[PDB]
Amino acid sequence: ENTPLFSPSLISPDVLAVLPADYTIRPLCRSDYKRGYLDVLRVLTTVGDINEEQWNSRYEWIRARSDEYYLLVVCDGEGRIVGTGSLVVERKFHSLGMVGHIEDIAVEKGQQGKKLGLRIIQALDYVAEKVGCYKTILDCSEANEGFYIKCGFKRAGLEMAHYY
């Protein structure tokens, strides 16, 4: 239940080197249910009650796709998840090339503005580079553009949406 979602060898040594004392960034593991992962997600959207059975099934589902869905967490060294982010690696049918997609970055409100979001993005960029992505992309609002600029991203196009 402490078996990481993906290899810890995919975590940037340079990011680990600059985290606050006792903090770590690491792959999700199944035991993170107990470390307040869903609480960090509540920064992003309303989540809902989820029980350990459901968590365990959703964890086996993502683990079946661990060559695509890279979920990592920032742990405060006291058993509390305080940040998360996702890299989804799109393996094309670019001479069969690969694009990383950054998704669902969240930092607990009380821990915001301490570079933990930057560290999460640096870590997801390092995963994507390591697995052979030529680029990482993400969609953002006009309001958090300046966050992604500080993380070394540049405007590349427009996000278009269609609602049902």
Ligand X SMILES: Clc1ccccc1-c1nnc[nH]1
The answer to whether 59 and 50 are in contact (CB under 8 A) is no
Q: Least distance from C-beta 106 to ligand ACO, angstroms?
A: 4
Is 163 one of the annotated binding-site residues? yes
Q: Does 11 bind a second copy (CB under 8 A)?
A: no
How far is C-alpha 3 from the geometric centre of its chain's CA atoms? Answer: 17
Please state the closest distance from residue 131 (CB atom) to ligand X, in A: 13
Q: CB 15 → ligand ACO: shortest distance, Å? A: 12
Residue 5 assigned to a binding site = no
CA distance 3 to 10: 14
How distant is the alpha carbon of residue 14 from its chain centre?
A: 17
Tokens 């990481």: give the residue.
4
Q: Give the C-alpha separation, 161 to 2, whole Å.
A: 38
Find where tokens 């903090």 sit: 23
Range in contact with ligand ACO (rule: CB under 6 A) among 15-23, 51-59, 68-76, 96-104:
96-104
Residue 87 binds to ligand ACO (criterion: CB under 6 A) = no
- Output the smallest distance, CB 65 to ligand X, in A: 8
DSSP 32-44: GGGGTHHHHHTTT
**Which is nearer to ligand X, 22 or 159 (by Cβ)?**
159
Which residues bind to ligand ACO, rule: CB under 6 A? 43-44, 102-107, 112-118, 138, 140, 143-144, 146-147, 150
